[PDB]
Amino acid sequence: IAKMRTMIEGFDDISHGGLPIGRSTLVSGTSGTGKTLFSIQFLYNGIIEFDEPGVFVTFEETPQDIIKNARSFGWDLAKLVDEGKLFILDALSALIERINYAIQKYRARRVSIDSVTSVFQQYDASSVVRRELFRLVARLKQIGATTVMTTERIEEYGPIARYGVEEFVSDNVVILRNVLEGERRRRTLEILKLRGTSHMKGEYPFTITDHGINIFPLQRSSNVRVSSGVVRLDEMCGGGFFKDSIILATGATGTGKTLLVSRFVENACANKERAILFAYEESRAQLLRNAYSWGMDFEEMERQNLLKIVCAYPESAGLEDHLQIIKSEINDFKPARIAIDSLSALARGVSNNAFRQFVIGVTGYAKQEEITGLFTNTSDQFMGAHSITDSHISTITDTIILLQYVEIRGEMSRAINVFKMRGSWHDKAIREFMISDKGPDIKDSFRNFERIISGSPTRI
Amino acid sequence: IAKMRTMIEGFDDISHGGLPIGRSTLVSGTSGTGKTLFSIQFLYNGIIEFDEPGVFVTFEETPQDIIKNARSFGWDLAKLVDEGKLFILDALSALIERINYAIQKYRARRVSIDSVTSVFQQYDASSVVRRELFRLVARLKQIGATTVMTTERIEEYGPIARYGVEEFVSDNVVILRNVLEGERRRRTLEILKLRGTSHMKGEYPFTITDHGINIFPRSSNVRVSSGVVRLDEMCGGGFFKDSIILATGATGTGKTLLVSRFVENACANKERAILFAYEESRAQLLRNAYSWGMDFEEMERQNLLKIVCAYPESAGLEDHLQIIKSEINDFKPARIAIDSLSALARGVSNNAFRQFVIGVTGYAKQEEITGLFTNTSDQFMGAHSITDSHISTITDTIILLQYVEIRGEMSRAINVFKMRGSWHDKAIREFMISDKGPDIKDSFRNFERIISGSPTRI
Amino acid sequence: IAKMRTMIEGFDDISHGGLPIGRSTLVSGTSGTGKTLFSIQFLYNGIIEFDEPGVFVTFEETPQDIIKNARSFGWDLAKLVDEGKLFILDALSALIERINYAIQKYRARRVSIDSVTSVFQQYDASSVVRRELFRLVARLKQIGATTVMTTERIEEYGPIARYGVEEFVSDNVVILRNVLEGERRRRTLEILKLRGTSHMKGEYPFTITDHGINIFPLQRSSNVRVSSGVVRLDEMCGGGFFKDSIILATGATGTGKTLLVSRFVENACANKERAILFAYEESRAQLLRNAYSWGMDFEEMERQNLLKIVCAYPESAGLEDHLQIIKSEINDFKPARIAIDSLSALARGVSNNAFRQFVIGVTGYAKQEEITGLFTNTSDQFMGAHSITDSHISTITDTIILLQYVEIRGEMSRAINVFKMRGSWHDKAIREFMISDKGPDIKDSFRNFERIISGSPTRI
């Protein structure tokens, strides 16, 4: 079965090529899942990417309503209909024969039918629907047309379609979900069924933007080293960070993760390299005050157009939304390094399943475009080394910088340790460090101390 | 009763030798479970293996659709149709004799009906379906043909079929499931009832490949090297030609270094190894391998190493298992490394993971392949992690890597925790990583509670 | 109410005698629960165990289909029908009067009717079913026949029968379940209702075999001692194990539970006593290599037909299946001791409810046939003594042998302790032991050590 490249970002990987030629693909989903958007995109790409005649059969939406809605993504459907590339049929065996006419009228190779369940108010029997839907899809294959069929769902995990019959008649079934968990919405796409071919199984996160549908399916390694912004840190990292690596700074709240992130972004702009600080905790105003109090001027770095600062709320938007914002902001500014401050902020009110996929996408994209990523994470234990082990995220990252509070003679001191550095020697010392108006002052390790990992040493 | 071999990989073991002969087998499941693939593959195998005539009664899909779909697995039903071994007849009691004729006009013994549900568009009421289903089963056993019967489900754990009557009529019931959990699909097959014989009970994982449906239902004293000399010493003269070894420790303890040395040592005795990476990409592995004084590029140049990379959460565990089988059955390795188990366990039930590990262990041991599996522990005390894992009791050797805090420094220790059928060193030995690999030094004799990861000097 | 002994293994205990005389017993259950098997067995036993005329009314299954299916258990229904003992009626007031004829025709005392819901396609109303089912069961009591009525269920915990009416009309209700949990199947039987008599309540595990249905409902104690295979162990056990006792060896993976099991089975075959090693971890091949490496030849013991080795997968079959395999393998080989290696393997993917019942059945049967059981269990904690306390299994067993890793001057040594010995003195010392090519070498305890239980002693 030959497959029509839909050119929908992510879908051509998931469907192993695209939609089977001369075969009817069902696309069911609840209200506002983005069926119509998918339906139109299918034809838009095909028309303007392989000169492919495209016929859009409407039912509830007027051609003007359709055409107006698609101007959110900057698609001129009137222009394509003016050039005789599109063919919107305003609107069950008369339309069937009508459909074939337009197909022969413009040598049509792509059809989208939105929506195919609106047409079953006159019938309230799954039987009648089956028989009529069978005849429709049967005739389309006789023609040899590649059609995207749209139906509606009441439940996110119920029947595939309204009469639980539409999926068994169709050759290909794509399920669009808009799942609600924790008062937050996550769009996912599943290819359930492609008769006579293969595909990736399960749901995949996706987002709707001015681009349209953007699905996230799931040689290099350079020995070239980039600085952390801190000299002793570079020395304990056996010469500094690899350019194409993910570093994680983990420690309890106020250990100095953002100071580390500030130097790392400072250092970028001190070599005329661009950096994006993705803030998810403190806002721009605070970050600038604290940055400046450490002897770094982010306004200056933002003045030189070397720094970009993107602060959002870790629970305003879904994780796939944050993933797409990060991608576009990178594909735009073209940074040499990014900082995510922080991951633990993006992980709250999220399943470990969804958060892993997120991190993998950021990690993978950082590595595929050769951007040095420094991600922060606030440990939910006082003993930092236990928190690291109780996290799949810590085993995905290449370098781990552990920041740890240690109680010393009635004082709350802090230590730093390059916990892990894949592909390099690193210092194994748990070094005392102070924060001043000039930043990290990494001193010596605690030679006279046992159980430093606990955060409550005893003198040896 | 006599059972007819389907030659479906796994099914003949689950059904204890195939399908009751002359008897009707219902195969229900939701859309895209592979009911059609099963029903053809039943007919295809029957003709190609046992010269057994096969009639395919179709309703929704046309005979051209069947062959076109069926040619995805490299099956030429058209060729078989030309030679009059197959028969596709397109489509209440008219068909009964219509199919009875064809069966008798071919001397046929294998029939598949896809799908009986699609035909009761106009009956419903359950009673009607039952009475009409009774006739089909009664008037197929009367002939005495062996028919795979396809039916539809709406739910993965609801009614067996659409009208909840089709199973009580059928002599044999096979339920095809495509269960969605954590946004991951898992295909399972179950034999609910086989009237008059025995069968394996409950669900079993399966996959659809270019081969079709693939269901998953000596001990020599020969030793092999780990790649590490003093490790071979502590293992009382290296590993076994067979046996599963588990390297287990916190993130960045040196599991992957041990795995590199183990795969290196295969390729340095002209033996083939497969490194199954599920964490670091091929790109990074090569740099890290090369930085330790090992040339993986050379090992792939010599065609003694094959590196298979994939995302743990990309495909299901059933899927990963078949990739490992196929990649083994092709490359024919002496040893494999799986880096890591704990990656593949992410967002999986312990039940599904246990079965997966049992499959890889048993397959590695059936074909006599030395497996070194890594596992990143979720505790700082590795001995505790080891004990809180059923996988740890399945492996024959356990290599524990332990971070230990010594004089304000994060040192690492290695201990041959367990080794079945052999003496091993019981010493918890300090080791360091250089640009040349493991330097396994001496045990910490002056320290108590080294198992904790935070010794007190004694 | 007098009760007809059905002779179905386990059922005569659960039903407190059997089925009430001249009374209709409903047996509902989903497809493949073993209703027909029960239905036939009822008559088979009755005919061939008390010369009891038996009439089987069919509906969907032909007499030839019925007769052919029952040859899986070696029942010659044709032979019983040839001798005029059986009476299969191929097939709603005509059959009612027809049924009475056969009853008078052969002096019938047992009737089975499979299935009684197939007859209600012509009626789709619970009312009509009730009225017709009432009349049927009413007439059978007028005759004074003891009939097993079979209906079907859609759900494992839904309505008793398809119209939720059939149980209220019947005098006796038996529910057959085939419950699916963890992709594993468990058959259970419940007696819900026996009007005018008593019975055991709740579900009871059961299995279907070449014997048919085999349900598991739920003077001696000898001071005679049997050896463990280990001499010091016998000494610390104050003379060795009691013949009719359950010993549990618990410890972390690789502590030496199987070595203990190997000596225990070796010792049996060194006194010309038969032993069954039930392996659920390592397979025969490995066990023999490791056995032989400890100076024990299991091939030799299997050669002398003194050892049997049954290794299965702890998650191939259900727990009730494993219980029936153990029973048949014992009732066959007639061992003096058994070893289960191990319980923790059989406990994975199982509820504590189901696993307790399993252990109780093995324990009870071991004790009722006077077989010395040594069961192994891998502790899921490093501190073995904590694992013992966090287990109901450990309080059921008579003797507990604790195997414990202990960290001594940079070495991973192991200790052994007879934790508990009901009905005897035992050594209370936590003794260091080594494993060599000759097996356990139990040495001395750690007199100079505190917190040995932790697995990380400190020097005293």
Ligand SMILES: Nc1ncnc2c1ncn2[C@@H]1O[C@H](COP(=O)(O)OP(=O)(O)OP(=O)(O)O)[C@@H](O)[C@H]1O
């Ligand atoms: N420019 C845009 N930016 C963000 N979201 C957009 C944009 N344009 C459209 N959308 C999203 O697309 C959704 C509608 O998509 P579409 O019309 O394809 O849905 P549908 O499933 O066909 O709806 P229905 O089933 O109700 O007809 C809106 O709810 C909106 O959130």
Ligand SMILES: Nc1ncnc2c1ncn2[C@@H]1O[C@H](COP(=O)(O)OP(=O)(O)OP(=O)(O)O)[C@@H](O)[C@H]1O
């Ligand atoms: N060549 C192939 N390689 C891999 N997977 C394949 C291949 N061909 C088919 N499949 C898988 O098998 C599915 C088709 O199976 P099949 O058509 O038998 O399903 P079905 O249960 O009959 O569906 P329906 O109820 O819609 O008729 C595809 O959706 C895909 O997941």
Ligand SMILES: Nc1ncnc2c1ncn2[C@@H]1O[C@H](COP(=O)(O)OP(=O)(O)OP(=O)(O)O)[C@@H](O)[C@H]1O
């Ligand atoms: N010899 C045997 N060994 C093992 N299992 C057997 C054997 N004989 C029969 N069975 C089991 O018995 C089951 C069928 O039992 P039975 O026919 O009594 O079920 P039922 O509930 O009456 O079925 P239905 O409701 O579909 O008519 C089969 O699924 C099979 O697992």
Ligand SMILES: Nc1ncnc2c1ncn2[C@@H]1O[C@H](COP(=O)(O)OP(=O)(O)OP(=O)(O)O)[C@@H](O)[C@H]1O
């Ligand atoms: N060239 C080198 N020289 C010295 N030490 C090195 C070198 N390369 C790596 N190391 C050390 O070895 C570690 C890498 O070991 P490896 O990546 O095999 O560990 P791991 O436990 O498998 O890690 P992960 O949990 O990320 O999978 C580094 O963290 C560092 O301590």
Ligand SMILES: Nc1ncnc2c1ncn2[C@@H]1O[C@H](COP(=O)(O)OP(=O)(O)OP(=O)(O)O)[C@@H](O)[C@H]1O
């Ligand atoms: N030939 C041998 N010589 C010396 N020690 C041996 C020998 N064989 C095994 N051992 C020791 O015994 C251990 C294995 O013993 P055994 O298999 O009885 O343990 P177990 O607790 O049953 O393990 P598992 O959890 O894998 O079932 C090895 O790890 C090793 O310490």
Ligand SMILES: [Mg+2]
């Ligand atoms: Mg719409």
Ligand SMILES: [Mg+2]
């Ligand atoms: Mg911060």
Ligand SMILES: [Mg+2]
């Ligand atoms: Mg099909």
Ligand SMILES: [Mg+2]
């Ligand atoms: Mg690693």
Ligand SMILES: [Mg+2]
């Ligand atoms: Mg039955």
Ligand SMILES: [Mg+2]
């Ligand atoms: Mg053991």
